[PDB]
Amino acid sequence: MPHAFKPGDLVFAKMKGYPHWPARIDDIADGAVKPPPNKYPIFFFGTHETAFLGPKDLFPYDKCKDKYGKPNKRKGFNEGLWEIQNNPHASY
C-alpha cells in the first residue's frame, strides 16, 4: 500500500515540453524557500534544477524505469539517468 511522497523518494517527474525526467523529492534546507501548498520540491537529475510539482506529475522510478528510463537526446537527461541509478541521494 502506497504512502504519501516524502523527501528522498525517486521518481520520473513530468513537465510540459519535456520527457518524463529522472528526479527526486528534495528536502527543504533550513532557511530555504518552501514550496506552495500541495506541491513538492522536485530536484531533476542531470540538469540539477528544482521545480515545484504536485503528485499528478510524479511517477515512481522503480515501477516506471522500463518505460521512461531509456537514453534521450535532451540536455542533461543521460547524466540524470546515471545519477538516479548510481548516487540518487548525493549532494548536488
| Alpha carbons 34 and 50: distance in angstroms, whole number | 12
Q: Whole-angstrom Cα distance, residue 24 to residue 82?
A: 13
- CA–CA separation, 53 and 41 (whole Å): 7
Contact 38, 58 (CB under 8 A): no
Q: Helix, strand, or coil here: 29? A: coil
Domains in the chain (CATH in brackets) are 2-92 (2.30.30.140)
Structural resolution in Å: 1.5
Residue with cell 541509478: 85
When computed from its CA atoms, the radius of gyration of the chain, rounded to whole angstroms, is: 12
Write out the H or E segment, with its range, that includes residue 62: helix 61-68
**How far is residue 38's CA from residue 5's CA, in Å, rounded to a whole number?**
11
Q: For residues 88 and 2, give the distance between their C-alpha atoms in angstroms, rounded to a whole number.
A: 21
Q: In the numeric block, which cell numbers belong to residue 20?
A: 518524463
Determine the Cα–Cα distance for residues 22 and 38; give it in Å rounded to an integer: 21
Number of residues written out for the chain: 92
